[PDB]
Design an enzyme around this catalytic site. Structure first.
Site, PDB file in Angstrom:
ATOM      1  N   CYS A 109      15.916   2.856   1.615  1.00  0.00           N
ATOM      2  CA  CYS A 109      14.603   2.423   1.016  1.00  0.00           C
ATOM      3  C   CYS A 109      14.333   2.138   0.488  1.00  0.00           C
ATOM      4  O   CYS A 109      14.790   2.651  -1.174  1.00  0.00           O
ATOM      5  CB  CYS A 109      13.385   3.520   1.257  1.00  0.00           C
ATOM      6  SG  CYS A 109      13.253   4.075   2.930  1.00  0.00           S
ATOM      7  N   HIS A 167       6.232   6.413   0.499  1.00  0.00           N
ATOM      8  CA  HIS A 167       6.529   7.693   1.362  1.00  0.00           C
ATOM      9  C   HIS A 167       7.729   8.607   0.398  1.00  0.00           C
ATOM     10  O   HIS A 167       7.856   9.659   1.251  1.00  0.00           O
ATOM     11  CB  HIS A 167       7.096   6.678   2.584  1.00  0.00           C
ATOM     12  CG  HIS A 167       8.425   6.349   3.004  1.00  0.00           C
ATOM     13  ND1 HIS A 167       9.595   7.311   2.626  1.00  0.00           N
ATOM     14  CD2 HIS A 167       8.779   4.808   3.261  1.00  0.00           C
ATOM     15  CE1 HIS A 167      11.113   6.398   2.887  1.00  0.00           C
ATOM     16  NE2 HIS A 167      10.468   4.863   3.103  1.00  0.00           N
ATOM     17  N   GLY A 197      18.666   5.866   3.087  1.00  0.00           N
ATOM     18  CA  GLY A 197      18.868   6.694   1.267  1.00  0.00           C
ATOM     19  C   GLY A 197      18.627   4.840   0.561  1.00  0.00           C
ATOM     20  O   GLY A 197      18.663   4.187  -0.499  1.00  0.00           O
TER      21      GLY A 197
HETATM   22  C1  FHR Z   1      14.623   5.123   3.637  1.00  0.00           C
HETATM   23  O1  FHR Z   1      15.411   5.153   3.072  1.00  0.00           O
HETATM   24  C2  FHR Z   1      14.884   5.237   4.917  1.00  0.00           C
HETATM   25  C3  FHR Z   1      15.370   3.551   5.584  1.00  0.00           C
HETATM   26  C4  FHR Z   1      16.129   4.407   7.184  1.00  0.00           C
HETATM   27  C5  FHR Z   1      16.933   5.222   7.440  1.00  0.00           C
HETATM   28  C6  FHR Z   1      18.077   4.840   8.545  1.00  0.00           C
HETATM   29  N1  FHR Z   1      18.228   3.244   8.423  1.00  0.00           N
HETATM   30  C7  FHR Z   1      16.588   2.770   7.891  1.00  0.00           C
HETATM   31  O2  FHR Z   1      16.802   1.554   7.550  1.00  0.00           O
HETATM   32  N2  FHR Z   1      13.313   5.357   5.493  1.00  0.00           N
HETATM   33  C8  FHR Z   1      13.312   6.438   6.457  1.00  0.00           C
HETATM   34  O3  FHR Z   1      14.294   7.043   7.094  1.00  0.00           O
HETATM   35  C9  FHR Z   1      11.600   6.779   7.472  1.00  0.00           C
HETATM   36  C10 FHR Z   1      11.131   7.327   6.161  1.00  0.00           C
HETATM   37  C11 FHR Z   1       9.950   7.053   6.483  1.00  0.00           C
HETATM   38  C12 FHR Z   1       8.817   6.553   7.660  1.00  0.00           C
HETATM   39  C13 FHR Z   1       7.296   6.676   7.172  1.00  0.00           C
HETATM   40  C14 FHR Z   1       6.479   7.548   6.757  1.00  0.00           C
HETATM   41  C15 FHR Z   1       7.608   8.897   6.234  1.00  0.00           C
HETATM   42  C16 FHR Z   1       8.785   8.608   5.895  1.00  0.00           C
HETATM   43  N3  FHR Z   1      12.010   6.676   8.762  1.00  0.00           N
HETATM   44  C17 FHR Z   1      12.880   5.791   9.834  1.00  0.00           C
HETATM   45  O4  FHR Z   1      13.248   4.861   9.096  1.00  0.00           O
HETATM   46  C18 FHR Z   1      13.051   6.273  11.053  1.00  0.00           C
HETATM   47  C19 FHR Z   1      12.283   7.512  11.750  1.00  0.00           C
HETATM   48  C20 FHR Z   1      13.488   7.494  12.983  1.00  0.00           C
HETATM   49  C21 FHR Z   1      12.616   8.586  14.685  1.00  0.00           C
HETATM   50  C22 FHR Z   1      12.553   7.565  15.459  1.00  0.00           C
HETATM   51  C23 FHR Z   1      13.249   6.841  15.655  1.00  0.00           C
HETATM   52  C24 FHR Z   1      13.386   5.297  14.567  1.00  0.00           C
HETATM   53  C25 FHR Z   1      13.116   5.875  12.817  1.00  0.00           C
HETATM   54  N4  FHR Z   1      12.791   5.468  11.999  1.00  0.00           N
END
Ligand code: FHR
Ligand code: FHR
Lengths: 296, 294
Positions: free
Chosen positions: B141, B39, B139
């Site tokens: 991920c 992603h 950040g």
């Molecule tokens: C990567 O670095 C982040 C790690 C998240 C950020 C906050 N704490 C974590 O572990 N990953 C994300 O932000 C994902 C983004 C992808 C997910 C699916 C495919 C495309 C983008 N999003 C989430 O983790 C997320 C969004 C969200 C919205 C509403 C409720 C919960 C929620 N979790």
């Protein structure tokens, strides 16, 4: 919120095995010196009342076998500094990190790299108790393991492991060989003082709870330092100094909970208990996170 | 008794920073491949077509940095939900490693990283509902979970996302998600979690091996009667495999597995009445039989 250790790679590269006669333990190899507990020169005979100067003048360089992985390091000199032995070796460690020797204060935290036979085995976060012990996890042969903090590529070593007290908590020195707490490197009867809870760390942990969405313990009230300290004294909690209140400054501003307002919460927690509830994931008030630990 | 993580140095030397478009996360650099969550190529988050998103990328759209050094990407492919960036330079500090897929109840160390730089290390467990109770910020991920055994690093988890309950979901290093999750920002919910019974029992054995016997009693139980009781407290059922796995700790302490089951039943009934076990006021379930022995 989890207890988090510093990444340990910079310290893993400094761990070596030291053997003196029958005893094997760990050493810390920085530049051309290996540091380790001076009690490595004790035999069963000497351990009950050692004369370390006498025992050391007896030793020569070849009495110490120092092993960096598969490589034997040749000792070309030996010296004592307080309760640590300094073995000068052939070769400077080519992975010596930027480092400092620091002495920490009770209530401060550090990461422990537990080692056996010079090989790193595990890493975990500790706090220096107010009674100067460490609630560690150390087996036979763990002596010489170190505690450390990292600050932007600089490793600050603060602890080297020496002993386990009969209660199962642990005692050691700083890297200049000065003991933490009223302990001696002698096989004699030693006990930790009555311990107390690190009040400012508990407050930081409560602030960590509010930040992470658990606010059931907050109330509308506020206390005085004097009133809270009488409560703290009743429950074996370290007195909350005026400087303690100031270091919590950033957390009071981020959450809008003033320190004495949060103290009113803690005051009531010390009596109602948690009424069957949990705070972060804990049925106990946690005191091994510093204000800095929460912010990071 | 401490939750101990593995020393993280072998994994620290593999963490890099991957940027695509406006998104930066972490990658795992092993030999001449960087693995990261696919992603990273999203702008797109509710219904990404990753096949379409990826065919529009060329190598120079991926900026990979190992510390100060930029790594040139010479190819890319997608394996399930992980992106595999082929780079010009093999990691000279690649450890002995393997990719392993773990089952619920298994523990591992997490090296939390940001912008390709490691931040901290902590122990974690795969929950019965295939989430992990991690500590991850924006950040994170691409941070990985791992075990180390005889200088061989077994990578078992790569972080992708946070669920609305605050627990975390991710993949094995072949990019198959743990649990029923997908890399979409749609409504997905962790199933109801349970306590890992076999781990609680291992930890009570650890308590016995150290100093404590106060929770034992004179009763035994059948396996079926234990499971009928334990499930009323949202404990995972204990299987014959779990009973077998506990054999070594049973034989070392002299306490039959079903006798320890009887003690657990009473602990659930009574609580601990103001006492602690090892260091905890709760029944700990993130130590495995293997973790206790080691
Ligand atoms: C990567 O670095 C982040 C790690 C998240 C950020 C906050 N704490 C974590 O572990 N990953 C994300 O932000 C994902 C983004 C992808 C997910 C699916 C495919 C495309 C983008 N999003 C989430 O983790 C997320 C969004 C969200 C919205 C509403 C409720 C919960 C929620 N979790
Ligand atoms: C160093 O590797 C070990 C680490 C101990 C072993 C068990 N758990 C640990 O943390 N250090 C020791 O074994 C010391 C050695 C002594 C040498 C002479 C100077 C003082 C230290 N011994 C102990 O830690 C010790 C002895 C002892 C006897 C009775 C009850 C408790 C107890 N602890």
């Amino acid at each position: 919120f989890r207890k988090m250790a510093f990444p340990s790679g910079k310290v893993e590269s400094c761990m070596v095995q030291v053997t003196c006669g029958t005893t094997t333990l760990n050493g810390l190899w920085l530049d051309d010196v290996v540091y380790c507990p001076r009690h490595v020169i004790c035999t069963n005979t000497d351990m009950l009342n050692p004369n370390y100067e006498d025992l050391l003048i007896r030793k020569s360089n070849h009495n110490f076998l120092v092993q960096a992985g598969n490589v034997q390091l040749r000792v070309i000199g030996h010296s004592m500094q307080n309760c640590v032995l300094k073995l000068k070796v052939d070769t400077a460690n080519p992975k010596t990190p930027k480092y400092k020797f620091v002495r920490i204060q009770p209530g401060q935290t550090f990461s422990v790299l537990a080692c056996y036979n010079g090989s790193p085995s595990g890493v975990y976060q500790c706090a220096m108790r107010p009674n100067f012990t460490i609630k560690g996890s150390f087996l036979a042969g763990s002596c010489g393991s170190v505690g450390f903090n990292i600050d932007y590529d600089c490793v600050s070593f603060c602890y080297m492991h020496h002993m386990e007290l009969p209660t199962g908590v642990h005692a050691g020195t700083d890297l200049e060989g000065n003991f933490y707490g009223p302990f001696v490197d002698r096989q004699t009867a030693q006990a930790a003082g009555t311990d107390t809870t690190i009040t400012v760390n508990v407050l930081a942990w409560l602030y960590a709870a509010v930040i992470n969405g658990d606010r059931w313990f907050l109330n509308r009230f506020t206390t005085t330092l004097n009133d809270f300290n009488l409560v703290a004294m009743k429950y074996n909690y370290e007195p909350l100094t005026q400087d303690h209140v100031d270091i919590l400054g950033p957390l009071s501003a981020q959450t809008g909970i003033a320190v004495l307002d949060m103290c009113a919460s803690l005051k009531e927690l010390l009596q109602n208990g948690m009424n069957g509830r949990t705070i972060l994931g804990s049925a106990l008030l946690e005191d091994e996170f510093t204000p800095f630990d929460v912010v990071r």
